[PDB]
Write a protein that binds this ligand. Sequence first.
Ligand code: CL
Ligand code: CL
Ligand code: CL
Ligand code: CL
Ligand code: NI
Length: 556
Amino acid sequence: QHLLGNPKLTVTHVNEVKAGINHIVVDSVQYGNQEMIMEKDGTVEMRDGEKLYINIFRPNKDGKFPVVMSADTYGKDNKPKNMGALWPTLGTIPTSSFTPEESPDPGFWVPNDYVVVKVALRGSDKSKGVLSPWSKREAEDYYEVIEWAANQSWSNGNIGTNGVSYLAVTQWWVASLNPPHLKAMIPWEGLNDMYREVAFHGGIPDTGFYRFWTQGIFARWTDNPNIEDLIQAQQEHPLFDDFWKQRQVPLSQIKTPLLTCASWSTQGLHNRGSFEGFKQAASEEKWLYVHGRKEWESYYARENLERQKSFFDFYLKEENNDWKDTPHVIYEVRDQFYKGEFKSASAFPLPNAEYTPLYLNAENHTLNHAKISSAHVAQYDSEDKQQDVSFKYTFDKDTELVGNMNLKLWVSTKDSDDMDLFAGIKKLDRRGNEVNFPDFNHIENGQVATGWLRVSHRELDQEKSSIAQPWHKHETELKLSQDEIVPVEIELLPSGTLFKQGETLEVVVKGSEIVIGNSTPGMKTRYEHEETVNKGMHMIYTGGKYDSQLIIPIVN
Ligand SMILES: [Cl-]
Ligand SMILES: [Cl-]
Ligand SMILES: [Cl-]
Ligand SMILES: [Cl-]
Ligand code: NI
């Protein structure tokens, strides 16, 4: 039958397709050689007269179909990319040749009688307009394309958005505007608060990935003079001010039926906001899927395509399938690299989480059940990349930690008026060796959880903070005096991990990155934090009034 495709046809070589309506044959990963129509370089006109450029892949037959859409500024005609040698840890990513990275593959969706629309947002492709990534103005353009699509001859009126990374962030954005024909959304790993999630971590500027990403956009469209200079924006907006508030999606405006993917493996880019989107969305019908595996690999994996399709068959085809039997949260409890167990819950944060303090003791590198009665101080050189302080707890029984963790420290410094603190959670096996996990950006020597804070940014938003997840206002800098001892709470980003009986959790605090390096030597694919306020010794106080502690989310 037709899902085996037609092996008599030759696949359309994608760089040879010309503008207009084309009959093409797609090298589908699932369904062999698949005939369809591709309309290349169609335009949609914005309210201000700007044209946005798109491709439309649709069944070669009359009729009305549900529509799958994605939008970004990376190039709508990108042929997906010696990657095996150049970025070996990307994992297995099977797609047709008509799938720009992270996009819904028309070779999967179109044979299942969906239309796929690929949108080049303003400033990209033949548009030389303003390119302001992850903004409301970009969201407004996306909204126009959704509503236009709903009125086309091949459209059943129901548009669902889908895609990874930039293609996910733009969904949080457009959904906050509630387009009337946006009937479902699949933000598969996307941030939605640039200040907190990519431009700065805990107030410390990302000098790596953020800048690499920004430069990449500039390099992609060198003949567009209207690309927003986000390098300079980072320099001149060090606090969460009116500029950055406009780059935090108003998530509680979202009402659209929602399938979110978050990953334990993307801490430092999409992880925080993936969870924020799921949590804060007002949507009455929402689901979350969490894994501790690789990003694009998991998106394109057949089981996750089938999950996406089941959600869209319910919402876009209006089929009475059993989608709503799906538990609202499905999550991996990671044990080792690519080894874990998937479990389910009715909510995130997990309704059975017991937020449990472990108190730090500076004298003996321990985390403890009981409070430490007398105040002591530990110390590390903040400029020596080999120095840190660490604290360990060995479990007496199998324990699952799933959710946020909060590291409360009392700290001071003598040689600077500020401190950059780098926190990490590690798991050590029964032999005392670190157990590595997938981590950002597609590194395999990562850790359990990571967090950051610039201490002048420590002031908490009391309304938004919780016992497991501190929320920092980032409104004003509270610089320090010599030996001013201050309380800080560091956001360890959401993680899911089993600690077996005999295994150890280790907190590490340091003046620089805890896990070093990346998976693409010479290219800044990972966060870096090379612009630091650190000088000299950092002090960490524990015991007595200095109730330094780690709050851990014990579940199951
Ligand atoms: Cl449920
Ligand atoms: Cl225990
Ligand atoms: Cl939690
Ligand atoms: Cl806020
Ligand atoms: Ni060929």
